[PDB]
């Protein structure tokens, strides 16, 4: 991977997303989607291992099918209204079609089996990229079309998203896999409030984003892929594993940490709109997230784990790659609750 080639892949991915959240013509939205697709496949193949080839192939198939169904919705609402402008749909089945087309790109409904696997395949930096940047475009499209989305569809889809997100992560030790399942749960979390008011899903997107960088940067600052590998890191990096623990507390949403604020906001606006049964389901099922969160915490910091003899010469070497933004990345993802009113800035 040529450094300059890697940079030009960075910015074509980012420009593909930018085209999505700045364009108005529907065709341009599709173009940005595949620009990002065509641009992110090579970086996922940076390591060039057969697992990476597997992950890239599954991503390609899923996202290509999803973009083709995206054009199907595109063509249908064009046919029934002759207007490429992105707005409320004028044909119902076109709206549904776009809903599953985007969802397959998000990993919400049973169209979510790709993400845990593809996260397993690629390197952790590619994992950060996949689970942070490749959500902004589909969320932005879903925000722009919130006028006419079948509320039943979006609600049930978010419900499965969070539910299988919680359940799938229980029996996973690979940190990449449990992070993928947690991201699926957060996907359900924001997409549940997507139909009602998009400011709150934007806020939850921001919090999940900052938490995800604050997470992945800690992982590859510890260089761990399995739970046992992270457990061995309780020694070398005690500060890193303590911050590991505090952000793992911010994971579930235990007050007064940052992660509680989006849950609180989403539930409060859901209750404003007579949806009282609905919020209790994610409120209960967040304990499923908190379960393997607590398991990760126990393996990381709360309980000392048996280290290794050779491991001691690691004591002689220091992490040289700075991996900047980590301090503020932690801080914004831990203590921003007294700043909840600032949500009105996004509105």
């Amino acid at each position: 991977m040529n450094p300059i080639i890697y940079t030009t892949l960075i910015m074509t991915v980012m420009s593909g997303t930018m085209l999505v959240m700045i364009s108005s013509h529907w065709l341009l939205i599709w173009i940005g989607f595949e620009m990002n697709l065509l641009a992110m496949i090579p970086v996922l193949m940076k390591n060039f291992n057969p697992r990476a080839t597997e992950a890239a192939t599954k991503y390609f198939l899923t996202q290509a099918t999803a973009s083709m169904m995206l054009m199907m919705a595109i063509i249908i609402n064009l046919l029934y209204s002759g207007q490429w402008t992105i707005t409320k749909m004028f044909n119902p089945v076109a709206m549904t079609m776009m809903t599953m087309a985007l969802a397959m790109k998000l990993g919400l409904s049973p169209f979510h089996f790709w993400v845990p696997e593809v996260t397993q395949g690629i390197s952790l930096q590619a994992g950060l990229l996949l689970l942070t940047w490749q959500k902004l475009a589909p969320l932005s499209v879903l925000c722009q079309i919130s006028q006419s989305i079948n509320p039943n569809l979006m609600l049930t889809m978010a419900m499965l998203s969070i539910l299988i997100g919680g359940w799938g992560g229980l029996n996973q030790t690979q940190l990449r896999k449990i992070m993928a399942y947690s991201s699926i749960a957060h996907m359900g979390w924001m997409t549940a409030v997507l139909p009602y008011n998009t400011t709150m899903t934007i806020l939850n997107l921001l919090i999940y984003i900052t938490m995800t960088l604050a997470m992945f940067m800690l992982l590859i600052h510890s260089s761990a892929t399995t739970t046992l590998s992270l457990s061995h890191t309780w020694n070398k990096m005690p500060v890193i594993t303590s911050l590991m623990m505090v952000t793992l507390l911010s994971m579930g949403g235990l007050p007064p940490l940052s992660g509680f604020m989006p849950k609180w906001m989403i539930i409060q606006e859901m209750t404003k709109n007579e949806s009282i049964i609905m919020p209790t389901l994610m409120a209960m099922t967040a304990l499923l997230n908190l379960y393997f969160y607590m398991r990760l915490a126990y393996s990381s910091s709360l309980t000392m784990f048996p280290s290794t003899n050779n491991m001691k010469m690691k004591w002689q070497f220091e992490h040289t790659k700075q991996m900047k933004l980590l301090p503020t990345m932690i801080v914004l993802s831990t203590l921003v609750l007294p700043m909840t009113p600032a949500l009105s800035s996004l509105n």
Binding site: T96, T99, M104, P110, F111
Partner: peptide, 15 residues
């Protein structure tokens, strides 16, 4: 993905 497409499409009839 397949059977989900029809369950969303015709069985429930989301539209």
């Amino acid at each position: 993905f397949l059977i989900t497409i029809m369950i969303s499409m015709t069985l429930f009839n989301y539209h």
